[PDB]
Each structure stands twice: as C-alpha cells, then as structure tokens.
C-alpha cells in the first residue's frame, strides 16, 4: 500500500504511484537523474591517422 516507481520510454516519463511525501521526494529523484551527458559520452569516435579503421 506504500509508494511505487515506474517509467515510460515512449515519452520518457517518470511515473510515481503513492504519497505526497513520495511526490515530494520522487520529484527530487526525477531531477537527480534527469542530468544530461557532459561532452564525453558512452560512445566515442576515434579518428585514426596512420591506422586503417
């Protein structure tokens, strides 16, 4: 009967189901992980100069 957590990947939407303390703290957790990448990603592309890709 306590607050639970979800998401949609079509709209990329967080879904909460619970308390307003859960609204209060999971709007924080929405914001905690809604951070973007900073330049350096998961994937890089190396431009090789003397080596053939």
């Amino acid at each position: 009967l306590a607050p639970k957590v979800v998401a949609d990947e079509r709209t990329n939407s967080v879904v909460v189901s619970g308390e307003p303390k859960a609204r209060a703290r999971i709007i924080q957790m929405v914001r905690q992980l809604d951070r973007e990448l900073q330049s350096q990603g998961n994937t890089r592309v190396f431009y090789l100069k003397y080596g053939k890709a």
Binding site: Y47, K49, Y50, K52
Partner: protein, 53 residues
C-alpha cells in the same frame, strides 16, 4: 583485362599532413596490336608497383 596507364589508389589521411597511399599501379601494353606471341593469348609489358607508402 584493362592494360594501360593504371593508377588504383586508396588514400588515407593523417589528421595533420602526411598521406598513407595504398598504390597498385602499372604501365602495361600488349606489345604490338599487329604482333603475335610464342605462347597462345596476348602478352603484356608491365611496370607495376603495389605498396603502401
């Protein structure tokens, strides 16, 4: 068979200046278009060099 002045080249660029050139080239000829061979088909005078530089 394509016999003439051939340059087949796949260049590859060092970020800055110097080119890696994969060369397969030759200057080849069917001797004389009115001359035969001691063999069976046409023969070719070729000057070839295939290298990366």
């Amino acid at each position: 068979k394509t016999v003439g002045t051939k340059l087949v080249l796949t260049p590859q660029i060092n970020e800055g200046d110097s080119v890696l050139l994969t060369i397969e080239q030759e200057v080849s000829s069917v001797g004389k278009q009115a001359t035969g061979t001691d063999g069976l088909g046409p023969t070719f005078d070729t000057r070839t060099v295939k290298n990366a530089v």
